[PDB]
Amino acid sequence: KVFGRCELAAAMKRHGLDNYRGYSLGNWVCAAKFESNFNTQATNRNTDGSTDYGILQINSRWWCNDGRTPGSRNLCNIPCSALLSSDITASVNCAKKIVSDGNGMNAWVAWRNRCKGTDVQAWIRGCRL
Ligand SMILES: [Cl-]
Ligand SMILES: [Cl-]
Ligand SMILES: [Cl-]
Ligand code: NA
């Protein structure tokens, strides 16, 4: 599924991401935009052989099992394919563990490089929330 901007904001808000660990909703929508272009089916293979999955491009090196990432962990205790559903629950819940692990949203490279220090509130502007 390819989400609309405000559609994703609303879904994220319902699942409790607005101000989660101090990151306003705008940050999460911005991260999703640049990580996946709002596409729940996005995948990208990294040079080390791991793969990034879903709307938030969560990495198989640590967070999910895809069966082809030797030496990896599955810290969200899910198959990576569950991160590709049109239902974003699994992605959001896993994202909550990631952002809690000490590095905050800097764990998403696209957030650090393209959202951090910008007017992130712009990404939820116009939305009925
Ligand atoms: Cl915001
Ligand atoms: Cl694996
Ligand atoms: Cl933080
Ligand atoms: Na893994």
From Swiss-Prot:
Cysteine disulfide links: 6-127, 30-115, 64-80, 76-94
Stored InterPro entries: Glyco_hydro_22, Glyco_hydro_22_CS, Glyco_hydro_22_lys, Lysozyme-like_dom_sf
Tissue/organ expression: In the egg white and polymorphonuclear leukocytes.
Reaction equation(s) it catalyzes: Hydrolysis of (1->4)-beta-linkages between N-acetylmuramic acid and N-acetyl-D-glucosamine residues in a peptidoglycan and between N-acetyl-D-glucosamine residues in chitodextrins
EC number in record: 3.2.1.17
Enzyme class: hydrolase
Record localization: Secreted
C-type lysozyme domain: residues covered: 1-129
GO molecular function: beta-N-acetylglucosaminidase activity; identical protein binding; lysozyme activity
Keyword Iron-sulfur recorded: no
UniProt entry tagged with the keyword Signal: yes
GO annotation terms (biological process): cell wall macromolecule catabolic process; defense response to bacterium; defense response to Gram-negative bacterium; defense response to Gram-positive bacterium; killing of cells of another organism
Primary location: secreted
Catalytic residues, chain numbering: 35, 52
Classification via SUPFAM superfamilies: Lysozyme-like
Binding site for substrate: 101
Pfam families, A to Z: Lys
GO CC annotation: cytoplasm; endoplasmic reticulum; extracellular space
Keywords carried by this UniProt record: Allergen, Antimicrobial, Bacteriolytic enzyme, Disulfide bond, Glycosidase, Hydrolase, Secreted, Signal
Binding partners and assembly: Monomer.
Extra remark beyond the main annotation: Lysozyme C is capable of both hydrolysis and transglycosylation; it also shows a slight esterase activity. It acts rapidly on both peptide-substituted and unsubstituted peptidoglycan, and slowly on chitin oligosaccharides.
PANTHER family: LYSOZYME C
Protein family membership: Belongs to the glycosyl hydrolase 22 family.
Record's function text: Lysozymes have primarily a bacteriolytic function; those in tissues and body fluids are associated with the monocyte-macrophage system and enhance the activity of immunoagents. Has bacteriolytic activity against M.luteus.
Annotated protein name in UniProt: Lysozyme C
